[PDB]
Amino acid sequence: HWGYGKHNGPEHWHKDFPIAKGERQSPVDIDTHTAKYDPSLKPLSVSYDQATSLRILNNGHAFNVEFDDSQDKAVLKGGPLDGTYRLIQFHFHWGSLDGQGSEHTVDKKKYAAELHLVHWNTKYGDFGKAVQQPDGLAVLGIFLKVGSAKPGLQKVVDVLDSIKTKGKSADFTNFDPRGLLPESLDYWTYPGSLTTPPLLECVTWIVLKEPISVSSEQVLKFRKLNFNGEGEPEELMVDNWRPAQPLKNRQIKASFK
Ligand SMILES: NS(=O)(=O)c1c(F)c(F)cc(F)c1F
Ligand SMILES: NS(=O)(=O)c1c(F)c(F)cc(F)c1F
Ligand SMILES: OC[C@H]1O[C@@H](O)[C@H](O)[C@@H](O)[C@@H]1O
Ligand SMILES: OC[C@H]1O[C@H](O)[C@H](O)[C@@H](O)[C@@H]1O
Ligand SMILES: [Zn+2]
């Protein structure tokens, strides 16, 4: 199956997922000078106060923190979005070293990691139907730089020892994703895709301009996870990012003047 290594990584994915060479693939480089303020954007609303986290899972590519999406408990609205998008999971992408790890880049600069909060459009009833639609998903992306610790990340870091290998999961109730946000909600937005196979072109990307700071110790614990399953030779879970893809016939819009 697909992965991030030399023999099954991003440069190979197109052989099983030909949309990898499609017209609205993600991530992209965000050219901050070409991005244009868009007055048609409405205020962005991140409404996570009633979020219900359930479980954390090592899926062999990253770890997902999963939420109850059976009701509008945690939703994203506004900005470029038409209607209500419900939070289903978050995960990260990160590097082997602090100088790489993000999927999106900003004027070609790579951050140490990138957080993705994944939401599906409730008009389509389930995530599976949403990923058959051009406006099925909204992903809120947040860059991570290394500096001071992020207190709201520490509960995630401390459970990782219990999900070291592919297929392991643990209870992860009562986690508040609001503690992962930066102060500002200034953002860039563009139409794109999943950054992982099957690379479906369903996503409205909303990428926050302000990075969060995490400590070196926090990201070092991400890098102790394993891509492999229990009892197999250790392959550290690092560099689980897709590089920037061609912008093609797209424009990146900014929420800020
Ligand atoms: N296209 S892919 O990245 O999904 C892939 C490969 F490139 C491969 F060489 C072997 C696989 F099993 C596989 F699934
Ligand atoms: N990176 S991503 O935010 O595009 C993403 C998704 F949106 C998704 F629904 C499932 C994934 F596995 C995934 F990595
Ligand atoms: O034709 C002019 C229009 O060109 C488009 O490509 C831009 O997105 C608009 O902001 C602009 O008003
Ligand atoms: O909030 C996520 C998790 O944080 C800590 O691990 C708590 O010990 C655990 O009870 C909780 O599920
Ligand atoms: Zn992602």
Curated annotation (Swiss-Prot):
Result of altering residue 2 to A = Impaired activity, not rescued by 4-methylimidazole (4-MI)
InterPro entries with a match to the protein in the record: CA_dom, CA_dom_sf, Carbonic_anhydrase_a-class, Carbonic_anhydrase_a-class_CS
Q: At what residues does the UniProt record annotate the site feature described as Fine-tunes the proton-transfer properties of H-64?
A: 4, 59, 64
Which cellular compartments is it found in? Cytoplasm; Cell membrane
Q: Reported effect of changing residue 114 to Q?
A: Strongly reduced activity and sulfonamide affinity
Q: What is the effect of changing residue 196 to S?
A: Enhanced p-nitrophenyl acetate esterase activity, but normal CO(2) hydrase activity
Per the record, its GO cellular-component terms are: apical part of cell; cytoplasm; cytosol; extracellular exosome; myelin sheath; plasma membrane
List required co-factors.
Zn(2+); Co(2+)
Mutagenesis or variant effect for residue 59 to H: Reduced proton transfer
The family database entries (CDD domains) matched by this protein are listed as:
alpha_CA_I_II_III_XIII
The effect annotated for residue 59 to D is: Strongly reduced activity
Q: What is the effect of changing residue 62 to S?
A: 2-fold decrease in enzyme efficiency, as determined by kcat/KM ratio, and efficiently inhibited by chlorzolamide
> What does the annotation give as the result of altering residue 91 to C/D/E/N/Q?
Strongly reduced CO(2) hydrase and p-nitrophenyl acetate esterase activities, impaired stability of zinc binding
Q: Which reaction does it catalyse?
A: hydrogencarbonate + H(+) = CO2 + H2O; urea = cyanamide + H2O
Task: Name the consequence of residue 89 to P.
Answer: In OPTB3; in Czechoslovakia
Positions that bind substrate: 195-196
What positions are marked as the site Involved in the binding of some activators, including histamine and L-histidine? 89
pH curve summary:
Optimum pH is 6-8.
Q: Which UniProt keywords apply?
A: Acetylation, Cell membrane, Cytoplasm, Disease variant, Lyase, Membrane, Metal-binding, Osteopetrosis, Phosphoprotein, Zinc
Gene Ontology MF term list? arylesterase activity; carbonate dehydratase activity; cyanamide hydratase activity; zinc ion binding
- The organism's superkingdom is given as Eukaryota
Q: Which family does it belong to?
A: Belongs to the alpha-carbonic anhydrase family.
Disease annotated for this entry: Osteopetrosis, autosomal recessive 3: A rare genetic disease characterized by abnormally dense bone, due to defective resorption of immature bone. Osteopetrosis occurs in two forms: a severe autosomal recessive form occurring in utero, infancy, or childhood, and a benign autosomal dominant form occurring in adolescence or adulthood. Recessive osteopetrosis commonly manifests in early infancy with macrocephaly, feeding difficulties, evolving blindness and deafness, bone marrow failure, severe anemia, and hepatosplenomegaly.
Extra remark: Target of drugs used in treatments against glaucoma disorder and breast cancer.
Protein name, please? Carbonic anhydrase 2
Q: What is the phylogenetic placement of the source species in the record?
A: Eukaryota, Metazoa, Chordata, Craniata, Vertebrata
